[PDB]
Design a protein around this nucleic acid. Structure first.
Ligand SMILES: Cc1cc2nc3c(=O)[nH]c(=O)nc-3n(C[C@H](O)[C@H](O)[C@H](O)COP(=O)(O)OP(=O)(O)OC[C@H]3O[C@@H](n4cnc5c(N)ncnc54)[C@H](O)[C@@H]3O)c2cc1C
Length: 456
DNA sequence: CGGCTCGCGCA
DNA sequence: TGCGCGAAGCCGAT
């Protein structure tokens, strides 16, 4: 659909029909940003070709009840900043409350939409919302992959077994899909309160807030303030100050040398393609650049591939045959310790390293990338069954992680418990052939005493 | 057949 | 800390 600096492979037609005579409507779900947005740049071009304005719709759902205030305030505060940014380019933002499957279809007919465009997401709920809108609209419906550098359907047409099989496919398509972002052209034809929806949300999530003994909340919101502007500063400081030492100190939780970009990347407050563009042109350490590029390109977009081609990505069935047979044979094995969800949530285990890792999660909303493996693998070792281990790990991940409810989370949890995108290892009791990590293993790689003392 | 994102003994 | 090896099942380039 027109456009010079616009690859048609990033878009795909979800429905066909006659184009309406009204404005094009962009359904923003995953990429909550105004700059470096392919789903928004594509919508503007269709608006420009049809001589119609472009509108923006965001449907606030009841999914915030499953999460806490840490994720609600992070998403809401960025939307208020995004509302101002879109207002500077004569683009209107409409915020709705309810089911997108019924409110979006009502918004298309009420506003007389000509075309409908949305961003890509491999989650189950999004496909259910799309099918509901599909049956309630008669205007063309398009979808743009504005999250991945290479479109998910274009990178691979099959659930990839490992990264070493997905690595040659992604890097072969990089010279085509890795490109600069054209500027967002403002509108030519111009035609709920976010503050009110913020107070009503925190009031409904107050009783479920994480608290300490003295009735003091555990979350510390000053570590990462949200917003598109704040996401840029974190990226800029990483390239200039933390990119050089990334390849050597990425597995040390005592050193704050990670990019800290997941909370912004999950909500779409910054484009991962923009991160690649600035990282590629930076004169850093070559070993650190390759290590970082493999993390945000191969392992971030293969999680989308995992959830897209596996509808049961958060279940035991999505595990490989070798892991399922290994875990089933050790179901009756006696566990050294058995902890419930509440004991894992409050950090009441015998391991001071695991408890400290959970405290970093409960205090900052983000846990170090290295300790997340030990946090999840120890749940499998100290649970009733692999199903309960998967349930506890997913619950604690989606409730307290700022980057939770993400394809990176489900793939990452399935890696630690089900060996997805991994291989077999030494045979052990309970865990079987799943990769094993011990407290002594972390002792020889980083100062464990510094990590435990930092988070009580 | 070669190589995959741990623990372990050893400088 | 950094390095080579062990231990394990399997994809895919042929
Ligand atoms: C059990 C478990 C659960 C996880 N939960 C989540 C989650 O809920 N949300 C989430 O976004 N990530 C999750 N991850 C992935 C990883 O822990 C985080 O992406 C990372 O630790 C966030 O810190 P960072 O962005 O500073 O890391 P960096 O080293 O700076 O990574 C840069 C970016 O690369 C990507 N990335 C890095 N490591 C991974 C990985 N292992 N898998 C996929 N993408 C990766 C992310 O987009 C990240 O923002 C989890 C990992 C594990 C093992």
């Amino acid at each position: 659909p027109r456009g010079s600096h616009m690859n048609p492979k990033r878009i795909r037609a979800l429905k066909s029909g006659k184009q309406g005579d009204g404005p094009v409507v962009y359904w923003m779900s995953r990429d909550q940003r105004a700059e470096d947005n392919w789903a928004l740049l594509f919508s503007r071009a269709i608006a420009k070709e049809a001589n119609v304005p472009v509108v923006v719709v965001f449907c606030l759902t009841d999914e915030f009840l499953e999460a806490g205030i840490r994720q609600y305030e992070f998403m809401l505060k960025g939307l208020q900043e995004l509302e101002v940014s879109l207002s500077r380019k004569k683009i209107p933002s409409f915020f709705l409350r309810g089911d997108p499957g019924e409110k979006i279809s009502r918004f298309v007919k009420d506003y007389n939409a000509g075309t409908l465009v949305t961003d890509f997401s491999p989650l189950r709920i999004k496909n259910q919302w799309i099918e509901k809108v599909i049956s309630g609209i008669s205007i063309p419906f398009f979808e743009v992959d504005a999250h991945n550098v290479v479109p998910c359907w274009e990178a691979s047409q099959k659930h990839e077994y490992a990264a070493h099989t997905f690595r040659p496919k992604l890097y072969a398509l990089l010279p085509e899909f890795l490109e600069e972002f054209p500027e967002l052209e403002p509108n030519s034809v111009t035609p709920e309160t976010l503050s009110d929806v913020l107070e009503t949300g925190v009031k409904a999530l107050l009783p479920e807030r994480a608290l300490l003994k003295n009735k003091d909340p555990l979350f510390e919101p000053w570590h990462f303030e949200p917003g598109e502007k704040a996401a840029k500063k974190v990226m800029e400081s990483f390239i200039a100050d933390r990119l050089d030492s990334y390849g050597a100190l990425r597995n040390d939780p005592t050193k704050n040398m990670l990019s800290n970009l997941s909370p912004y990347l999950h909500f779409g407050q910054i484009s991962s393609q923009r991160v690649v563009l600035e990282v590629e042109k930076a004169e850093s350490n070559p070993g650190s650049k390759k290590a970082f590029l493999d993390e945000i390109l191969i392992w971030k977009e293969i999680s989308d591939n995992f959830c897209y081609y596996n509808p049961g990505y958060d279940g035991f069935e999505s595990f490989p045959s070798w892991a399922k047979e290994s875990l089933n044979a050790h179901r009756n094995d006696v566990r050294s310790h058995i902890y419930t969800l509440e004991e894992f949530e409050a950090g009441k285990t015998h391991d001071p390293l695991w408890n400290a890792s959970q405290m970093e999660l409960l205090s900052t909303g983000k846990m170090h990338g290295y300790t997340r493996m030990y946090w999840a693998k120890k749940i499998l070792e100290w649970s009733e069954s692999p199903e309960k281990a998967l349930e506890i790990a997913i619950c604690l991940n989606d409730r307290y992680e700022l980057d939770g409810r993400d394809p990176n989370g489900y793939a990452g949890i399935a890696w630690s418990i089900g060996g997805v995108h991994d291989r077999a290892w030494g045979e052990r009791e309970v865990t079987g052939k799943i990769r094993y990590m011990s407290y002594e293993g972390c002792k020889r790689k980083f100062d464990v005493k510094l990590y435990i003392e930092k988070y009580s």
